[PDB]
Amino acid sequence: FHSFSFYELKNVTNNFDERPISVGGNKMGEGGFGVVYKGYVNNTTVAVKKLAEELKQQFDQEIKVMAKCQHENLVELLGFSSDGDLCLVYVYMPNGSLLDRLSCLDGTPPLSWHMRCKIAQGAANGINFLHENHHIHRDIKSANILLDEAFTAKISDFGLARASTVMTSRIVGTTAYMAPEALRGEITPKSDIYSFGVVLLEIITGLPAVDEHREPQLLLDIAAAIEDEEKTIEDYIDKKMNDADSTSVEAMYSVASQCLHEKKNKRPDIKKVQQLLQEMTA
Template sequence: MDGSSLIRKLPPGIVYDLVHMLEIRDAWKQLMAVVPREGCESDDCYVPKYKVEHMKLIEQAGVTQRQPCAEIFLDEWRMSGRKQSDLTFLLQQLGKAELFRAADYVADLMKVLYLSVPPLERPVTGPAAPVDVSEKTIEKRLANLPLKTSEPGNQYNTVEIDRAFDEMTEADGSLPSLDGPRIQAVGEVMQEEQSVFCGVTPRGESDGLGKQKTLPVDQLETLRNVSLHLDTVLPHLQYSELERFTDCFNELPLGNNGGRKLGAGTFGSVYLGILPSQKCVAVKRLHTDAVNVEKQFQNEIESLSRFRHNNLLGLLAYSCDSSTRCLVYEYMRNGSLQDRLACKDQETALQWRTRLSIGVDTARGIVHLHTTFEKPLIHRDIKSANILLDHQMVPKLGDFGLVRLGQQSNSMTMPTTTVLGTSAYMAPEAFRGDVSVKLDTFSFGVVLLELLTGLPPYDDGREGHDLVTHVEAMCEETDSINMLLDKQAGDWGQSHDTGCKEGPSVAVSLYTVALNCIEDNKRKRPNMTTVLQCLEEIIGFIT
């Protein structure tokens, strides 16, 4: 190899290592998003080579061919174009995508091959910053650490914890106690004081629609985390405390020999935490190598601090005193809507009335995001896996890592070159980087189809892999959803004993709303306020 070594000439072993790194948290998507079109590499005329349609095709090919998506992408990239990419160009693109682990690997490879390594800008702080791990540096830091003493009964800041969790958690006597002494709360806190501390209005104040009032942004008395510049009223918990609550982040699945793991996603894994008071919380530990992990962390904290609602997942606290960021949420006993529709762990199927209620309440949460302030908050990742169900089957929308603040109401579209989300739920314009509140409408329409059919959003075993394509193909001739209705849900309001007034069945009405939501032309697609009104009219027919 020489100074212009091409990516396509890399030995299989090196390609294998790169593929392994780029498969972690779908990092290949981040790299794919920054690759420029040939001849448009400079910043002043940058044009991306790939669109999100290409990402979707690679995802589908990965499933059908049983091949890593990162490998398919690298094969396409290194073999395409008149001017094929070399190692220097690969290193530059990895730097732009902030994939520094892979960038360091390529830089070390170039040094071994006696190639010149271009300077690569890296963040000064954060997980991506270079770390000096020499023995001399480590010994110096250890010598400067203060001695810590442990006092019995003073392991937790119990006053702060009780204030943060008392309003939004509940005790569960069926769960095992934590080892060690039980810590008693010091003093009592007034309910109103607790509510203000948590960033919510006192219990009993609502707008008549079952949602809590939101504090105006300009009236929030915020606490600022200096290192991360976080504006939030939420309490900070030490990582060591969260380790205690989660049995050191026990990786065994919940219910398996004392396991605590509830699940895992793109940005982190979630564990059951049991407080000394026996209240239950869900602790999300973010992956340190996840794409834009600091941005996801900040998004969740600052968004959920301001947007409080009965149908939005309650964020209770956060932790950033270690290299691993953590978020603490309400514990949702019935898991995700996706798992319940799939009858995971042999759970009974959701009945149609419950499904309709879940759809209406989820829409209320989305409308709250879109309308509370002058600029809407666009969720960008609405899906059944992010709709969690509490002990009473009340849905709460979570995972705000991809939220985007929209423009004012008279200008609701924003172009972007970074496309994130889950492809089976993404509107056509999302693949062009067009971000507006109508993205959330489309995604919610897919959720409605899941409620109607009980089918997964993506399945490579059916002719239309994604649910929208499958439903359109199956219902094209009859224009009816009846053949795909989930029969386990009941009769969908067709029998006389449901109290249904004369008119279309619940399923037909719900399907009509879903079709409007998944309209390809976003101008014809309704906003979520209109969608909510339609759903509430459906409820009116059965009451």
């Protein structure tokens, strides 16, 4: 929408105070080749991404997409800055990232099963909208699903997004969430479905996708051993909730497992996911 100057964004972000908001600085998180700061423009609380070449691509990209695609489950951009490193201004997300809330970072209460089931549908409804509008996110992860005052899931980061069985030399995304074909250079909506299946797994277990100090390191692998009756979801169900139902949790593991078929073509499409996630909350 608007075109803020470096200096205003600078002045209302205490000169991009890299100290964390917890200490009473402005730094909220680090993502999309940049650092996200708390701002206060237009008498409203916002989020200001200062961008760390190809950089101008990921900037002007995140504008094009964000200008075409608005939806209840996608973050909204308010404006930007070119005047002296680039900046993007977004609507504040008071409950930050699903990752940070899943790990109860900074002491936030654990998310219920109920809140978890609505966050899953939200995230689906945001991807689907992306997929209906011939868009591939390429970076569906926990850290890219933000949470509002209502704990409504909002997908962020389209500075990697691409419009739509194609191949790319610039392989990019997050290893611990990426599909095999995406890992070898395939650009296919079917990759976004797999990543999402990792997110379903994080929602169910509360485990990060990678933990270098866990056996095994990768959540993907916990799902494989379960598919091989070497483990149970039941054993991994996050203990930090009191409302979880076995039927309901098993219904969501079901969607995940299908999302994580290593055969791109055996993966459900976003609508099947949307539908499956609905039928579970019935």
